[PDB]
Write a protein that binds this ligand. Structure first.
Ligand SMILES: CCCCCCCCCCCCOc1cccc(O)c1C(=O)O
Ligand SMILES: CCCCCCCCCCCCOc1cccc(O)c1C(=O)O
Ligand SMILES: CCCCCCCCCCCCOc1cccc(O)c1C(=O)O
Lengths: 206, 222
């Protein structure tokens, strides 16, 4: 029954160091791990996959055609307002291209913070109050929920963090109120289909 | 700073029901054992240099009613002992719907212990992490409407100043007993950077050595 999985992808740098290689090498292997995890979720009927790089987006827009062919809807979540204008437009175009797709929804966090996400929704509500279009006492959990990232998708069912640390590190906060939390010491470049299925079992067991 | 590095521990206390069932005992016995484990953990935190301990009794009309009974009886029975151990007691959660006599007893218990200089003990009662954020948001929205605040002045530090426990040390460590790996709408905003520590030990069995195990895991992982 797992509909929406979120992953904190950690361990690329530490993997590279264990390999006796520089950081770039771990990023390349981390990108291979992204492709594998996205294929696996799309092929196993997961509705939404949300990926957070913990410690990029330009490396990504060479993959959009392939996502589109696979019926993946791509969304970026996070504060892209200070990205350069050309990158912002490439993000917008890639979202627009795939927006109609009905397969896996892939959310890529880019300069995302779970507190930022809440604050951006609160600011929207504050504007509405200032305009006289909303009473402070009318603000409830449903209403805030409507102004935080991914409110259109299935609730996050499972959060996986690779890399060994046992923290959310200001990834999703509002959205993980009822999610299963699964931590694995496996470093992100090594995280493969067996590791993903193991997380899915922790979920199903429970 | 204590050697373990931990200023503020929050605990999701789960496993009372399962503990009683394993014993072939009704729920009430698990609740009595769980209360003994609360007193033990409070004493442990107070003696090991923790500044703040925040406790959440996991449960999931009759649910509300059992939770009210637990709270009312605890406030009745335990506040004098807290005061005599120099503990400063605070209740966090939406207590606005409690009848005015109960809200008065909460106020008097908080007032009584407010000058205490030992452990600060926060007890969640009708608490949810989402509710906590929402109440803070409503405080800000009132400031906007009573022209004192511009929407674009609202930032994370500002919202942080309106959620429960903002004046205490940040939560460093969340422990959940009882085997589930979920926050279950306990603290959300406040746990953005916290160490999350899950143990299969059932709440009534979680003792000083388990608590020491969680702090030393914090000290070593931080
Ligand atoms: C910022 C956006 C870039 C993120 C894209 C991450 C890389 C994913 C590229 C996907 C490569 C092909 O991805 C599939 C997707 C869905 C179903 C699939 O079967 C496959 C399959 O190769 O088998
Ligand atoms: C609603 C209020 C619920 C509060 C329930 C917690 C009550 C705990 C009773 C106090 C137990 C005695 O707890 C200590 C606390 C601090 C330092 C201590 O040394 C002790 C010590 O030696 O027992
Ligand atoms: C030493 C004795 C220890 C026992 C006290 C520590 C735990 C007390 C937690 C009490 C939870 C009260 O929680 C409610 C009370 C009334 C109405 C409620 O809806 C709730 C609700 O959380 O939904």
């Amino acid at each position: 029954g797992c509909r929406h999985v979120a992953i904190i992808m950690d361990g690329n740098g530490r993997w590279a160091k264990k390999q006796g290689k520089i950081r770039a090498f771990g990023h390349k292997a981390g990108a291979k791990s992204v492709r594998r995890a996205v294929s696996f979720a799309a092929n196993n009927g997961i509705e939404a996959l949300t990926l957070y790089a913990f410690s990029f987006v330009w490396a990504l827009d060479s993959e959009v055609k392939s996502l589109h062919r696979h019926n993946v809807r791509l969304r970026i979540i996070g504060d892209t307002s200070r990205f350069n204008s050309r990158l912002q437009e490439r993000i917008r175009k890639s979202e627009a291209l795939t927006a109609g797709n009905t397969g896996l929804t892939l959310n890529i966090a880019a300069n995302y913070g779970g507190r930022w996400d809440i604050v951006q929704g609160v600011r929207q509500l504050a504007e509405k109050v200032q305009q006289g279009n909303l009473q402070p006492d009318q603000i409830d959990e449903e209403m805030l929920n409507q102004h935080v990232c991914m409110h259109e998708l299935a609730p996050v069912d499972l959060v996986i963090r690779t890399g060994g640390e046992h923290r959310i590190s200001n990834f999703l906060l509002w959205q993980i109120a009822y999610a299963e939390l699964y931590f694995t010491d496996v470093l992100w470049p090594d995280f493969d289909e067996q590791d993903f299925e193991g997380a899915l079992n922790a979920f199903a067991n429970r």
